[PDB]
Coordinates of C-alpha atoms and ligand atoms in Angstrom, one line a residue:
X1 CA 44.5 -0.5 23.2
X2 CA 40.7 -0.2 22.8
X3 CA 39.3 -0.1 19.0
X4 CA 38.5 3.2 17.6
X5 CA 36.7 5.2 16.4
X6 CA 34.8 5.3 19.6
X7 CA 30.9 5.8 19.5
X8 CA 29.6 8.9 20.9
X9 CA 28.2 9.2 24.3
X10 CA 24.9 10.0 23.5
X11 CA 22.8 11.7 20.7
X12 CA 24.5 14.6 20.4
X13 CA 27.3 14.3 22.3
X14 CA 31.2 13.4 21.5
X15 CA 32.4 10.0 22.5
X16 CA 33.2 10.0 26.3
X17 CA 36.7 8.7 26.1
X18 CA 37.8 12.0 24.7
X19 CA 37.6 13.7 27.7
X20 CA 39.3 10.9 29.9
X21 CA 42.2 10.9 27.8
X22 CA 42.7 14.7 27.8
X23 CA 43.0 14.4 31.5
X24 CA 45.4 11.7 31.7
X25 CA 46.6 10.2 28.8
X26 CA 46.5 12.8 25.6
X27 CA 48.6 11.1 23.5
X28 CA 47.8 7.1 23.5
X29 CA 47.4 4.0 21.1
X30 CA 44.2 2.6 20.1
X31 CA 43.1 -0.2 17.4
X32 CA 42.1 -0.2 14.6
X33 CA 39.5 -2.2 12.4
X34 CA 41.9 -4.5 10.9
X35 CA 44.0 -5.0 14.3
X36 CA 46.6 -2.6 13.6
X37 CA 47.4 0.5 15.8
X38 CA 47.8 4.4 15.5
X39 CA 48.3 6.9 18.1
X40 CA 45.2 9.4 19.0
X41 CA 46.1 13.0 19.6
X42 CA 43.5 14.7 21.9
X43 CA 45.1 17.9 23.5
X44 CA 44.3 20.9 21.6
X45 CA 48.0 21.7 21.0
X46 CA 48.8 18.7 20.2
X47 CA 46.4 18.2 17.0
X48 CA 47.3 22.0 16.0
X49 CA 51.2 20.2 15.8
X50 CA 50.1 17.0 14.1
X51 CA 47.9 19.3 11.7
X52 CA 51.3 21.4 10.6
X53 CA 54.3 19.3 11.4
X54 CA 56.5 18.4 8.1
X55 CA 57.8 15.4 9.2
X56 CA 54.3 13.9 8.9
X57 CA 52.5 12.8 5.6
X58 CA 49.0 12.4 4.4
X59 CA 50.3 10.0 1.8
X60 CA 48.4 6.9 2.0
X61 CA 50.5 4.8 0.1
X62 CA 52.7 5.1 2.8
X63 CA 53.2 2.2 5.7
X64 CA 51.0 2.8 8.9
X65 CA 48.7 5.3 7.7
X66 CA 45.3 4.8 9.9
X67 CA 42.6 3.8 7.4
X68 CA 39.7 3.0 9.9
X69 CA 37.7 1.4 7.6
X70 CA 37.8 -1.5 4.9
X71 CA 36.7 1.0 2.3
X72 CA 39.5 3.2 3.8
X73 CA 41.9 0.7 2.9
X74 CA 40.7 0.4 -0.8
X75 CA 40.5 3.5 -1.3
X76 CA 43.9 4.8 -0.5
X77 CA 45.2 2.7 -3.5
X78 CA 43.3 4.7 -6.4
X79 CA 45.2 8.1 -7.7
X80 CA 45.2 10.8 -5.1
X81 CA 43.7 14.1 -5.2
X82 CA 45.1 16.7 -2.7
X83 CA 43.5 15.7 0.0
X84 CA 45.7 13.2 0.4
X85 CA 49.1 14.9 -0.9
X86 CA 52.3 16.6 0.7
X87 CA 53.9 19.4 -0.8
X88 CA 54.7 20.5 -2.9
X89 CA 52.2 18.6 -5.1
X90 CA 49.5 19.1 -2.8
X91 CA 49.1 23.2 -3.2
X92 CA 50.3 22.8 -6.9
X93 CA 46.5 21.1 -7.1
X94 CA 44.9 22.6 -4.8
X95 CA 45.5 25.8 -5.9
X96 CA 43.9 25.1 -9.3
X97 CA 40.4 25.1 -7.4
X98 CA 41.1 27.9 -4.8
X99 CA 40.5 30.2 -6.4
X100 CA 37.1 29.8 -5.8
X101 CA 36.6 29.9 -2.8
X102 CA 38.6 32.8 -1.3
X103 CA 36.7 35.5 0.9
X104 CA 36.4 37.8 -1.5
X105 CA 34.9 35.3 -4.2
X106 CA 32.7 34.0 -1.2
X107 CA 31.6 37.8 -0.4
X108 CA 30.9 38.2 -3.8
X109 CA 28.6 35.0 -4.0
X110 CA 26.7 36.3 -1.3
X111 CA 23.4 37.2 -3.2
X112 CA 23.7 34.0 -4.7
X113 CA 23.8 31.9 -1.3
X114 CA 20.7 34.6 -0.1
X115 CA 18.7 33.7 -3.0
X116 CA 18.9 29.9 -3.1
X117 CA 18.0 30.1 0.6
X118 CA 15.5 32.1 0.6
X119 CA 13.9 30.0 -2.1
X120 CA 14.2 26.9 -0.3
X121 CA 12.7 28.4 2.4
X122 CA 9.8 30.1 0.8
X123 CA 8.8 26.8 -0.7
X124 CA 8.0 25.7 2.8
X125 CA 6.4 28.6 3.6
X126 CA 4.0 27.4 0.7
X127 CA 3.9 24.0 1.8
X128 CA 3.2 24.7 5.2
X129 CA 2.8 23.2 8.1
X130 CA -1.3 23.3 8.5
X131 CA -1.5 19.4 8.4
X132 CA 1.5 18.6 10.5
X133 CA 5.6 19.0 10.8
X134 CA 7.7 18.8 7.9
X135 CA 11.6 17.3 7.0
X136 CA 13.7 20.5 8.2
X137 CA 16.8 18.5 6.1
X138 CA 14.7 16.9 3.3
X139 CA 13.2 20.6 2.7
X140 CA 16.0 22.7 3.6
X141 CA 19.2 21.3 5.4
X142 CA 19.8 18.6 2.2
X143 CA 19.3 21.0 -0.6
X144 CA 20.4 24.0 0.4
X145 CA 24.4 23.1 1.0
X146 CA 23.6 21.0 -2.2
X147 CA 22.3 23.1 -4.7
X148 CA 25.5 25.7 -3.7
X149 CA 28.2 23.2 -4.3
X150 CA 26.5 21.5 -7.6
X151 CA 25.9 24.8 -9.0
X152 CA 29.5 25.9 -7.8
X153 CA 30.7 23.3 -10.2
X154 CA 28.8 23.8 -13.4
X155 CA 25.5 21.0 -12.6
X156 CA 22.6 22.9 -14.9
X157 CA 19.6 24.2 -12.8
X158 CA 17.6 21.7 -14.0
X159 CA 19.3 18.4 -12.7
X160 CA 19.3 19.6 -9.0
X161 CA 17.4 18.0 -7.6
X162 CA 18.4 14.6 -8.7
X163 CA 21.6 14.8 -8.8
X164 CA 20.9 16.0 -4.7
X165 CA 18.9 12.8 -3.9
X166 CA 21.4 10.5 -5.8
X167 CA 24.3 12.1 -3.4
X168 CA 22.7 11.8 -0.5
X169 CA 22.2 8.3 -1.5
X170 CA 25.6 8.0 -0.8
X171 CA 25.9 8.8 3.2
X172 CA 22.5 7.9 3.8
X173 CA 22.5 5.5 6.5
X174 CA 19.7 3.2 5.2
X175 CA 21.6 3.0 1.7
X176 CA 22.7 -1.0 0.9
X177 CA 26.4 -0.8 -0.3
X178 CA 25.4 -1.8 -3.6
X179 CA 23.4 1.1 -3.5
X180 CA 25.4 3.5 -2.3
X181 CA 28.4 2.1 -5.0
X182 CA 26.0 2.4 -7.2
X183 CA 25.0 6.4 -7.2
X184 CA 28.7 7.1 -6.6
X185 CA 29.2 5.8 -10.0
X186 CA 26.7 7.3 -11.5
X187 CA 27.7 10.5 -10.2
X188 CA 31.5 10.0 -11.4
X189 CA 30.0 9.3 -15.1
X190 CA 27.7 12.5 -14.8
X191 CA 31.3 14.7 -13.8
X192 CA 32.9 12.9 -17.0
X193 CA 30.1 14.0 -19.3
X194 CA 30.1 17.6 -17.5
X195 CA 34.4 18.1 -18.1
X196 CA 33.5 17.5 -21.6
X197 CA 31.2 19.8 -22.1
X198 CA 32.6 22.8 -20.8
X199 CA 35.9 21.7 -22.7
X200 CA 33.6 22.0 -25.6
X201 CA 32.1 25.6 -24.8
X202 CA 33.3 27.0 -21.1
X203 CA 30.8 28.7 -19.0
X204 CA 31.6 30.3 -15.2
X205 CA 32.3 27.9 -13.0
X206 CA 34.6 25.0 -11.6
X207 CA 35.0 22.6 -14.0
X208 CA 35.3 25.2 -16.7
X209 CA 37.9 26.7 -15.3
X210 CA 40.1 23.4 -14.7
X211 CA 39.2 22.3 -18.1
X212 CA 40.7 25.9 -19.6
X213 CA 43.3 26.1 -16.9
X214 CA 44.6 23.0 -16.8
X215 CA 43.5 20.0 -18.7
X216 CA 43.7 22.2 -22.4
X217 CA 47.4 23.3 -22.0
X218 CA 47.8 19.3 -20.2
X219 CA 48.9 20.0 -16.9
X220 CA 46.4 17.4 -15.8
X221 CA 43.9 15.8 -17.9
X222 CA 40.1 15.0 -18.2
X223 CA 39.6 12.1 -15.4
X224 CA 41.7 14.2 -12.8
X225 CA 39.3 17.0 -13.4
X226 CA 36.0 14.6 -12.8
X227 CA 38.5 13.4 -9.8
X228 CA 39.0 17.3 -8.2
X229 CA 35.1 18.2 -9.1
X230 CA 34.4 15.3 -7.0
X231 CA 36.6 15.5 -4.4
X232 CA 34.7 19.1 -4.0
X233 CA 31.4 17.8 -4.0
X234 CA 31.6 15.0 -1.6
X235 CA 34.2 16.7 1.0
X236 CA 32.2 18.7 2.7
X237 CA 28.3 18.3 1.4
X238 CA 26.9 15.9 4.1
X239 CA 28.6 17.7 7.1
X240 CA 26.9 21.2 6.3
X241 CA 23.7 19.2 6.1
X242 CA 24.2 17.9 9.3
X243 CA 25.8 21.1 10.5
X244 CA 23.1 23.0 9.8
X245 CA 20.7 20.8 11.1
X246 CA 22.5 20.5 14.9
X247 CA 22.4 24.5 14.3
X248 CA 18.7 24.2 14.5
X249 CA 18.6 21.4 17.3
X250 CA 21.0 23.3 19.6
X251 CA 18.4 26.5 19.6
X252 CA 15.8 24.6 20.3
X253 CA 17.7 23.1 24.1
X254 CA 19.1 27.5 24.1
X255 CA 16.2 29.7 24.5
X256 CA 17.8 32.3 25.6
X257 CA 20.2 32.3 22.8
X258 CA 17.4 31.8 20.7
X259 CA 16.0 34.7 22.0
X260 CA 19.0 37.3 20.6
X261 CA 19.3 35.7 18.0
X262 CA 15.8 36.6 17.2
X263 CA 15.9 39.8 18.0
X264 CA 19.6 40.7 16.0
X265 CA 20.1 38.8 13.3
X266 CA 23.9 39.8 13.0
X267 CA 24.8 37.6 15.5
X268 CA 24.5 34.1 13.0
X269 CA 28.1 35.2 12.8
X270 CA 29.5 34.4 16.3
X271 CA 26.6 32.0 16.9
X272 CA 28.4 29.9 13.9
X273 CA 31.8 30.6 15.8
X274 CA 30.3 28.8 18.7
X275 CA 28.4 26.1 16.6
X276 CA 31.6 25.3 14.7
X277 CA 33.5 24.5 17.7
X278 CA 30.6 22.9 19.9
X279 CA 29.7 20.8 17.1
X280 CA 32.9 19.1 15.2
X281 CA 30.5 17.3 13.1
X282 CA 33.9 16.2 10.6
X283 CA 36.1 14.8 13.2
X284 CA 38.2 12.2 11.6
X285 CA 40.1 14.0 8.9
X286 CA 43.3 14.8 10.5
X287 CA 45.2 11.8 9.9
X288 CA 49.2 10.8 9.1
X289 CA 51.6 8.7 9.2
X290 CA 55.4 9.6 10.6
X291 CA 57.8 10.3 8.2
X292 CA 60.8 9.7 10.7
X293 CA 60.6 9.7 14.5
X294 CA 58.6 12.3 15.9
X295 CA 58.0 13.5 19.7
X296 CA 54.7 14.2 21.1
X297 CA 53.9 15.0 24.6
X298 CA 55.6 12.4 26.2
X299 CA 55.4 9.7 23.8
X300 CA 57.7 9.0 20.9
X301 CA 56.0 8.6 17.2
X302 CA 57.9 6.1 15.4
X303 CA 58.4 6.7 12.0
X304 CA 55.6 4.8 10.0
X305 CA 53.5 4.9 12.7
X306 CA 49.9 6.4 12.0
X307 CA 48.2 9.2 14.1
X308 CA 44.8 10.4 14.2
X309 CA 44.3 14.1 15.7
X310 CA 40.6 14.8 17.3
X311 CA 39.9 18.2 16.3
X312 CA 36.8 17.4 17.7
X313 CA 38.2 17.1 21.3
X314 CA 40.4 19.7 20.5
X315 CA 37.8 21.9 20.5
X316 CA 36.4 20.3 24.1
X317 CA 40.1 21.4 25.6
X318 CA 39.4 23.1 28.7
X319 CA 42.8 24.2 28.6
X320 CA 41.9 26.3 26.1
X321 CA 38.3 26.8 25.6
X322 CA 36.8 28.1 29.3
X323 CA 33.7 26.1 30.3
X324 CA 33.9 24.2 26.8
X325 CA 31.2 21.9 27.1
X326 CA 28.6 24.2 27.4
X327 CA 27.4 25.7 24.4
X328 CA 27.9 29.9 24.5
X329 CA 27.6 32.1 21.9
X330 CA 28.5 34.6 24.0
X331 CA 32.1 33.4 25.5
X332 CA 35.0 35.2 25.6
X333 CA 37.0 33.5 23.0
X334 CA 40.7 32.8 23.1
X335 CA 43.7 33.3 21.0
X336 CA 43.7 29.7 20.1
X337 CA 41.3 28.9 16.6
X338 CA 38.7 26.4 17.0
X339 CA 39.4 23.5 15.1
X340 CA 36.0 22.4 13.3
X341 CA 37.4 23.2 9.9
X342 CA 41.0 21.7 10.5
X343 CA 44.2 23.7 10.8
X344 CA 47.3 24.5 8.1
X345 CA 47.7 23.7 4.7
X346 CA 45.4 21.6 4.6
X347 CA 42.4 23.2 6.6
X348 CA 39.7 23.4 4.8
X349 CA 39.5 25.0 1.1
X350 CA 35.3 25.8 1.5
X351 CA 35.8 27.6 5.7
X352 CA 34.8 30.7 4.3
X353 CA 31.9 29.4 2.0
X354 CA 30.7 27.0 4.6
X355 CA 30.5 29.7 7.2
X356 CA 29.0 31.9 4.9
X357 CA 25.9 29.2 3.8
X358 CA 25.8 28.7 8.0
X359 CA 25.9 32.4 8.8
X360 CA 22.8 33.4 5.9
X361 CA 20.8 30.1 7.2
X362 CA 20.9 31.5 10.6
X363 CA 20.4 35.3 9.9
X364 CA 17.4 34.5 7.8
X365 CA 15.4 31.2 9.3
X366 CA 13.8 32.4 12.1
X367 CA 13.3 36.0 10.5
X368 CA 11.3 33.9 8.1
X369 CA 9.9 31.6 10.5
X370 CA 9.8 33.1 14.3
X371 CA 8.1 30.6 15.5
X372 CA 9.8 27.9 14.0
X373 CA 10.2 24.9 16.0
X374 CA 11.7 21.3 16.6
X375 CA 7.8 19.1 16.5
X376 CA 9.4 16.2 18.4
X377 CA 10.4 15.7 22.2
X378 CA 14.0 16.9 21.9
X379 CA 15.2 13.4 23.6
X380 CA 13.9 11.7 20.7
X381 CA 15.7 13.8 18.0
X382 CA 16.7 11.4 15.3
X383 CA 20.5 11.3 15.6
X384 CA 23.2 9.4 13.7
X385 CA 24.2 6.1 14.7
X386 CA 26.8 6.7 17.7
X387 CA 29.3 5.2 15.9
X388 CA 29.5 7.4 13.0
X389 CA 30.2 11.2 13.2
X390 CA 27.8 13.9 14.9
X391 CA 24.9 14.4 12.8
X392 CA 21.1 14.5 12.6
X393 CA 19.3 12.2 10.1
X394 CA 15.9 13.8 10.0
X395 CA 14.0 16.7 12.0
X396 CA 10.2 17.8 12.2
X397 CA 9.9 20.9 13.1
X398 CA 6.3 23.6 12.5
X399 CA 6.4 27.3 11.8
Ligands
HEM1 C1 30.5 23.4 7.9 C2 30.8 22.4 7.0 C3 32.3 21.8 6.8 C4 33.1 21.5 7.9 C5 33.0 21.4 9.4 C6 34.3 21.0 7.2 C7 35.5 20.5 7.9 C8 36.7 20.1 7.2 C9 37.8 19.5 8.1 C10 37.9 19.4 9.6 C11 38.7 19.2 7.1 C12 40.1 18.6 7.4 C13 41.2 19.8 7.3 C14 42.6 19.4 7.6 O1 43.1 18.5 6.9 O2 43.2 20.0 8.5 C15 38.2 19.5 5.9 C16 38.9 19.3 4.5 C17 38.3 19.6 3.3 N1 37.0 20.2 3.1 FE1 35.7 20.7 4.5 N2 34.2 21.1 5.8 C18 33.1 21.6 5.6 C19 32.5 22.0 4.4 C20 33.2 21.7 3.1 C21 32.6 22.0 1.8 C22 31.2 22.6 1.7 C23 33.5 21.7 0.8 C24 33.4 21.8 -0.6 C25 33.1 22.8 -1.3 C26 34.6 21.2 1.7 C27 35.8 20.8 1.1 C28 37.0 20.3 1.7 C29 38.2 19.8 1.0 C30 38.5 19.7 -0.4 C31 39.1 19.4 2.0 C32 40.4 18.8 1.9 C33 41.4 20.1 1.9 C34 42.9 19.7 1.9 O3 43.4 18.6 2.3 O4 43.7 20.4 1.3 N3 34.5 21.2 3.1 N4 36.9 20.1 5.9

């Protein structure tokens, strides 16, 4: 059983064993970092029937579930939010925040996610570019998924921008763990402070709304609320970052691509589609353990036994997605979804917002900047460390 998670291949490319196992072993074992086992799902199909399956369990107190790291394991033992809950408590919270984040709340923020792009990027358009390339995710990719979610949630204007710097504290690679313990405390304490406020005076957003909805009449109270606000925050924040900057590095190897996209805007839709799937930049969130015997493939899941489905190879499935490792805007999609935002219940509660923040970053970028461009030899593109998920640290680029 070789020890996984497995590093990627290369910079921007998913870890090579993927595709060996799709061919002839889908459904195998591998180790984990404290020498225990799980089973890795890697046929499209297959992660769709871990993803929905009742007779598995995202419980973590439960025995066998795959914690891959040492933080994993510590972590499971705190109270759970519903991330990692089975029904029926798991929708009975969720749905306190969903609200939120429906497409019809996500069309109506939609002037909202314009504006704060298009002041992020107008402040580089002041800035400029005269002496030399700039941070594309310091100035843009960082804030702009940042300032959404933080706003989303009640943070004042005015404690942005620290509050952005103190999160990404958290992920940032050259953080110390003291460090990074450290911010995520302080961040905690801020939440605390925030649930009591609006349980003082309400105002539209988040926490307000679990403070009157639910922690008033006591259906949870206060620390759950700092617990679901930051369960919200952290999710998802550092993969749009990351998401968005891969968007950026992918145009730069696709000039053709480039090219339409230049010339019609209205395709940041599909060109997301294709982004989504091409770059699974959260891959190691479907995860459960077997609540009784369960066949897959040709292999038997013993009950207690933890799996681990690779949406991210999923979405690499020749079987499904034609010429899959190529990236196309313009393929002829299937019937099957993409998996890059995860599939049933628990599929991710921000898809619609995050494609919406993705769709109005690439409708708008390079009608503000045409000649924006990556100021470093792609090769050299500053990636994540291959053993962590897909991602892009920093990027110079000049307009
Ligand atoms: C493009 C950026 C994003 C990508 C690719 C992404 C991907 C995912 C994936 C693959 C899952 C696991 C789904 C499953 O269990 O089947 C997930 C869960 C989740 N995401 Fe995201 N996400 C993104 C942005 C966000 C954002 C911006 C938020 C917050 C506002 C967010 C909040 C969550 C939450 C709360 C869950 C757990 C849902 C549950 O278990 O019920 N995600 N996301």
């Amino acid at each position: 059983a070789p020890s996984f998670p497995f590093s990627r291949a290369s910079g921007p490319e998913p870890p090579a064993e993927f595709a060996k196992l799709r061919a002839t072993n889908p459904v195998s074992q591998v180790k984990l970092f404290d020498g225990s086992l799980a089973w890795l799902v890697t046929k499209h199909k297959d992660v769709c029937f871990v993803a929905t399956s009742e007779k598995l369990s995202k419980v973590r107190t439960r025995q066998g579930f795959p914690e891959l790291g040492a933080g994993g394991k510590q972590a499971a033992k705190a109270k759970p939010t519903f991330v990692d809950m089975d029904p029926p408590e798991h929708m009975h919270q969720r749905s306190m925040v969903e609200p939120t984040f429906t497409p019809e709340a996500v069309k109506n923020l939609q002037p909202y996610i314009q504006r704060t792009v298009d002041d992020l990027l107008e402040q580089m358009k002041q800035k400029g570019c005269a002496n030399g390339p700039v941070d594309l995710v310091k100035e843009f990719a960082l804030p702009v998924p940042s300032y959404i979610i933080y706003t989303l949630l009640g943070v004042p204007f005015n404690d942005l921008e620290y509050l952005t710097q103190q999160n990404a504290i958290r992920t940032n690679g050259s953080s110390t763990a003291r460090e990074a313990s450290a911010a995520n405390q302080e961040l905690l304490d801020y939440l605390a402070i925030l649930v009591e406020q609006r349980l003082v005076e309400p105002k539209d957003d988040i926490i307000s709304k679990l403070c009157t909805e639910q922690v008033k009449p006591g259906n949870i109270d206060k620390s759950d609320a700092v617990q679901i606000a930051f369960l919200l925050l952290v999710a998802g924040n550092a993969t749009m970052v990351n998401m968005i900057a891969l968007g950026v590095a992918t145009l730069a190897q696709h000039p053709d691509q480039l090219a339409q996209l230049k010339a019609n805007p209205s395709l940041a839709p599909q060109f997301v589609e294709e982004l989504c799937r091409y770059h699974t930049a959260s891959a190691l969130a479907i995860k459960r353990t077997a609540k009784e015997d369960v066949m897959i493939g040709d292999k038997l899941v013993r009950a207690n036994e933890g799996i681990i489905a690779s949406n991210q190879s999923a979405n690499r499935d020749e079987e499904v997605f034609e010429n899959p490792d190529e990236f196309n805007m313009n393929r002829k999609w299937p019937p099957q979804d993409p998996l890059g935002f995860g599939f049933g219940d628990h599929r991710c509660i921000a898809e619609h917002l995050a494609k919406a923040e993705l769709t109005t970053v690439f409708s708008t970028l390079y009608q503000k900047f045409p000649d924006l461009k990556v100021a470093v030899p792609l090769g050299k593109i500053n990636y994540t460390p291959l053993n962590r998920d897909v991602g892009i640290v920093d990027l110079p680029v000049i307009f």
